[PDB]
Amino acid sequence: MNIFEMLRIDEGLRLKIYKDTEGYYTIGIGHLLTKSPSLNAAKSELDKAIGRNCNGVITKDEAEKLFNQDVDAAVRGILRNAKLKPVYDSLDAVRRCALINMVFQMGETGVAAFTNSLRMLQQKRWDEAAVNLAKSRWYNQTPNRAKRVITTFRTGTWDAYKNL
């Protein structure tokens, strides 16, 4: 298991514009297009992203390309962030994947509100951090996904995904 297969499990793959759990226009493997209500605004963002007239539809290859870009941008974002970088540097390789997963779903900014949990992860207080992470909107809104990620930070193994 690696970051790509993990995210592919959590996000799925859709080749036509769809609405995410928050109701935002998305495409591919969790690629947010716009937070705007206009499907037209979304179609336009899509075409800008791909470089062709897509008419709300892309190919597998195009979805995978967007995905490579997003994972890369997620990592690069963590490395540039003063709050995130030190946590990331402190973690083992499996746990790093859990942090990248959160960033990909909620952005650098959203992850940064998890101040208290970030501190516990840094300190390697696994059980404590798992309990703190669960006290969030994130967990109440997407509990199955939150559980998989939390289990990953708790144990440092891929158990929560070997099921899947």
Choose the catalytic residue: 20, 47, 108, 128.
20
Q: Reply yes or no on whether 20 is catalytic.
A: yes
Resolution of this deposited model, Å? 1.7
Determine whether 62 is exposed, middle or buried from the number of CB atoms within 10 Å of its CB (0-12, 13-18, 19+): buried
Q: Of 75, 81, 78, 64, whose CA–CA distance to 30 is shortest?
A: 64
Q: Is 114 annotated as a binding residue?
A: no
Q: Reply yes or no on whether 159 is catalytic.
A: no
Q: How distant, in Å, are the alpha carbons of 1, 112, 129, 136, 164 from that of 120?
A: 25, 13, 5, 15, 28
Tell me how far apart the alpha carbons of residues 139 and 126 are, in angstroms, rounded to a whole number: 17
Q: Is 132 annotated as a binding residue?
A: yes
**Residue-wise over 4-26: b if at least 16 C-beta within 10 A, else e?**
eebbebbbeebeebeebeeeebb
Read off φ and ψ for residue 25, nearest 5 degrees: -65, 125
The CATH number corresponding to 1-164 among 1.10.530.40, 3.40.50.300, 4.10.1240.10, 3.30.70.1060 equals 1.10.530.40
Q: Is 7 annotated as a binding residue?
A: no
DSSP 56: T
63 within 8 A of 88, measured Cβ to Cβ: no
The token pair that represents 82 in the structure block: 């003063």
Tell me how far apart the alpha carbons of residues 30 and 104 are, in angstroms, rounded to a whole number: 9
Choose the catalytic residue: 11, 45, 62, 70.
11
Experimental approach was: X-ray
The residue whose two tokens read 């992470």 is: 133
150 within 8 A of 133, measured Cβ to Cβ: yes
Q: Give Cα 155 to chain centroid, integer Å.
A: 19
User: In the chain, where do the E strands start and end?
Assistant: 14-19, 25-28, 31-34
DSSP 160: G
